[PDB]
Amino acid sequence: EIDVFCELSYRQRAMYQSLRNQISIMDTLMNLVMQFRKVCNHPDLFERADTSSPFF
DNA sequence: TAGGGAGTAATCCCCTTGGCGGTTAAAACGCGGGGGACAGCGCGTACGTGCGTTTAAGCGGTGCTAGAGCTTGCTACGACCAATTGAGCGGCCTCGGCACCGGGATTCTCCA
């Protein structure tokens, strides 16, 4: 059994920390631990990156 | 303090919608002609209008008594529930009613 640690990429931690900011109001925690598990898997699960352009 | 509710996502059965293909039967298209729609016409009779008659509907009034509408008293009966079972539902089976076919017989139409 080999443990393989890797840190949250800058996009993931932008998701994770703004999500964790909800703990300043709630604590829904069982909802948050599923959103935290999504971003810990891939942020496209939480918000799919897609072709984008400036504000019109 | 603990139990069971709230949240959520994976798991897997059920089932309704949609497409493909053919093919085949019914809808679409054409056209002749017929006969039924419909306009135009004549008559006559049947219905609206008017006037004098009558008839009885409607309003004001009197008297009566039935019976609608309310109060009281009580017990009968249907709501209620715990215990018992058998009537009636869901699943499975099969055979016989009925349909669908084919071909020969009787009916009905339409033109002569």
Side-chain angles (χ1 to χ4, degrees):
Chain A
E1 292 204 68
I2 301 188
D3 207 339
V4 181
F5 301 101
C6 198
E7 292 69 31
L8 294 185
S9 181
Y10 68 88
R11 191 183 175 217
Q12 284 173 303
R13 75 187 184 255
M15 304 294 88
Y16 199 111
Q17 200 62 233
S18 62
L19 180 63
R20 202 186 73 94
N21 188 49
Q22 304 307 322
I23 301 176
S24 72
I25 300 172
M26 311 309 298
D27 183 11
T28 289
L29 176 61
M30 190 54 177
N31 166 283
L32 295 176
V33 303
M34 198 59 69
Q35 302 203 54
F36 292 132
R37 287 169 81 183
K38 286 173 190 173
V39 311
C40 293
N41 280 24
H42 199 296
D44 284 342
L45 299 177
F46 176 49
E47 294 191 326
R48 181 61 184 238
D50 195 15
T51 178
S52 68
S53 73
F55 175 65
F56 175 65

